Design an enzyme around this catalytic site. Structure first.
Site, PDB file in Angstrom:
ATOM      1  N   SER A  66      25.752 132.882   0.713  1.00  5.50           N
ATOM      2  CA  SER A  66      26.731 133.924   0.440  1.00  5.50           C
ATOM      3  C   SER A  66      27.424 134.443   1.690  1.00  5.50           C
ATOM      4  O   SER A  66      27.470 135.644   1.924  1.00  5.50           O
ATOM      5  CB  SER A  66      26.066 135.068  -0.336  1.00  5.50           C
ATOM      6  OG  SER A  66      25.611 134.530  -1.575  1.00  5.50           O
ATOM      7  N   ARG A  81      32.324 132.052   9.289  1.00  6.33           N
ATOM      8  CA  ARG A  81      32.024 133.231  10.109  1.00  6.33           C
ATOM      9  C   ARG A  81      30.874 133.992   9.465  1.00  6.33           C
ATOM     10  O   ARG A  81      30.775 134.063   8.240  1.00  6.33           O
ATOM     11  CB  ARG A  81      33.256 134.133  10.264  1.00  6.33           C
ATOM     12  CG  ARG A  81      33.758 134.733   8.972  1.00  6.33           C
ATOM     13  CD  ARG A  81      34.892 135.745   9.233  1.00  6.33           C
ATOM     14  NE  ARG A  81      35.019 136.652   8.088  1.00  6.33           N
ATOM     15  CZ  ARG A  81      35.580 136.329   6.922  1.00  6.33           C
ATOM     16  NH1 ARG A  81      36.095 135.116   6.726  1.00  6.33           N
ATOM     17  NH2 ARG A  81      35.623 137.224   5.944  1.00  6.33           N
ATOM     18  N   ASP A 136      27.608 131.979  -5.531  1.00  8.55           N
ATOM     19  CA  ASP A 136      26.840 132.517  -6.665  1.00  8.55           C
ATOM     20  C   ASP A 136      27.603 132.524  -8.000  1.00  8.55           C
ATOM     21  O   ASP A 136      26.983 132.376  -9.061  1.00  8.55           O
ATOM     22  CB  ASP A 136      26.355 133.936  -6.309  1.00  8.55           C
ATOM     23  CG  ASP A 136      27.505 134.915  -6.157  1.00  8.55           C
ATOM     24  OD1 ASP A 136      28.253 134.810  -5.163  1.00  8.55           O
ATOM     25  OD2 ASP A 136      27.678 135.776  -7.036  1.00  8.55           O
TER      26      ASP A 136
END
Length: 467
Positions: A139, A154, A192
């Protein structure tokens, strides 16, 4: 309610009501933007291919792992698929050591491999019949050209782990797994919401979309390869034009151009004062995170215009984000006409004493803000359904707003009925309806690992040609 506050309540209704006609116009533009994000030129909606190119049948069986890396905890999940749209699951959460978030790549992957070993030795003390395929819900901003890959773009969420940005995390994890001789293969890395779609489709074959309605917002659905211009010339022969393709929309950026969403002056203030002004337009108009802030700004405007809290010290109300989602939630749940829970909420947390008529305005404001958010969220649902020609659908929903926000399910169902002008009595009989999703980051990653292994084991592609 005096004439003065009644006039102000009518102003609130004019500010925040979203008509069925407006929803339909938003949906048409949303469809255009979904198409634009799939085009070669692209658009504000990322429309990210998720590299799941088959539907689960519900007949799948076997043992599959999922991993999810949180800011606080690592979750490891074992899913045993039962072959009739059913499964059993168990999981362990492992607290990340304090240092890990700002440590090194080796430290991160070695920690995760050590937890996986502990987990596998607990549940398979005598070893396994074959290696366990693992799906990894990762995530953090990342991209992939095939499902068994993820290149970190990042770090976010306070992470700053050296030597990971710009690199593919899948081989980094797999190397640490192999160093410890754990019988696992990392075969998929997912968002997700893609997991919410696929897990829910495995248990409920009428699922057409996975949707997250919480602090963040997102939706995932299956498109078809022939409808994805930006993949033209990039696909291998075994991902053909009639192939399904799961899409992770990342549609929180819908209407950054500010052409259709009904932003008020308060929404403009929120955007101007946000970390990224001009970004995440649809998220700012639908996420639970901002609902209290919208109320806070409206109440300050009413105070400044001389209408409310006239003899109160409103100092605490001047703090941005002091009213979180629990404010409109508790206000909408307040059971009696005199709004006692609202009275306690304002007195206790903000040091503001209120009159009953003021609380009636606050309650109407909470209802208006919760209802607008639901009505705008279902425009995303309607756009996906209309784009793909789904006349009926289960929309597998998760997130703190869908799960906990008072009356949200009723607000969303009425919004869909209003869009489509259905002649239908019962909510349960709505052609397109929201239903509770299965666990996307755990169960869904494990099920995607299963679907991915079917293709991998056959030598079939799960990504761009040559990758």
């Amino acid at each position: 309610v005096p004439a003065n506050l009644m006039e102000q309540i009518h102003g609130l209704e004019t500010l925040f009501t979203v008509s069925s006609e407006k929803m339909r116009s938003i949906v048409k533009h949303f469809i255009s933007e979904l198409d634009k994000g799939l085009s070669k030129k692209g658009g504000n909606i990322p429309m990210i291919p998720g590299w799941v190119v088959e539907y689960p049948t519900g007949k799948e069986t076997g043992d599959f792992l999922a991993l999810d890396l949180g800011g606080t905890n690592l979750r490891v999940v074992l899913v045993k698929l039962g072959g009739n749209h059913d499964f059993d699951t168990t999981q362990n959460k492992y607290r990340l050591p304090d240092h890990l978030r700002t440590g090194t790549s080796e430290q991160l992957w070695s920690f995760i491999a050590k937890c996986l070993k502990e987990f596998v030795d607990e549940w398979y003390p005598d070893g396994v019949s074959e290696p366990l395929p693992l799906g990894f819900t990762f995530s953090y901003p990342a991209s992939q050209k095939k499902i068994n890959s993820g290149v970190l773009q990042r770090w976010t969420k306070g992470f700053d782990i050296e030597g990971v940005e710009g690199h593919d995390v899948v081989p980094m994890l797999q190397e640490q797994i192999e160093k410890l001789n754990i019988p696992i293969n990392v075969v998929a890395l997912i968002n997700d919401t893609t997991g919410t779609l696929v897990a829910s489709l495995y248990t409920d074959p009428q699922t057409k979309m996975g949707i997250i309605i919480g602090t963040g917002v997102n939706g995932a659905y299956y498109d078809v390869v022939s409808g994805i211009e930006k993949l033209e010339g990039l696909l291998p022969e075994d991902i053909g034009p009639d192939s399904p393709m799961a899409i992770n929309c990342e549609y929180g950026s819908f209407d950054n151009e500010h052409l259709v969403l009904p932003r008020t002056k308060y929404d403009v203030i929120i955007d101007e004062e946000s970390p990224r002004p001009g970004q995440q337009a649809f998220e700012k108009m639908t996420s639970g995170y901002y609902l209290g802030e919208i109320m806070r700004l409206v109440l300050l405007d009413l105070y400044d215009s001389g209408f409310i809290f006239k003899d109160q010290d409103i100092s605490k109300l001047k703090e941005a984000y002091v009213m979180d989602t629990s404010y409109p939630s508790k206000i909408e749940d307040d059971p009696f006409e005199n709004l006692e829970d609202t009275d306690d909420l304002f007195k206790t947390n903000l040091n503001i004493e209120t009159t009953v008529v003021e609380r009636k305005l606050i309650r109407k404001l909470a209802e208006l803000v919760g209802t607008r958010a639901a009505r705008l969220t279902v425009c995303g649902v309607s756009a996906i359904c209309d784009k793909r020609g789904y006349k009926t659908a289960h929309i597998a929903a998760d997130g703190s707003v869908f799960n906990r926000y008072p009356g949200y399910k009723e607000k969303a169902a009425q919004a869909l009925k209003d869009i489509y002008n259905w002649d239908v009595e019962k909510m349960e009989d709505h052609p397109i309806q929201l239903v509770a999703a299965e666990d996307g980051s755990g169960v869904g990653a494990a099920i995607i690992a299963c679907l991915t292994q079917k293709r991998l084991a056959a030598g079939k592609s799960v990504g761009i040609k040559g990758e």
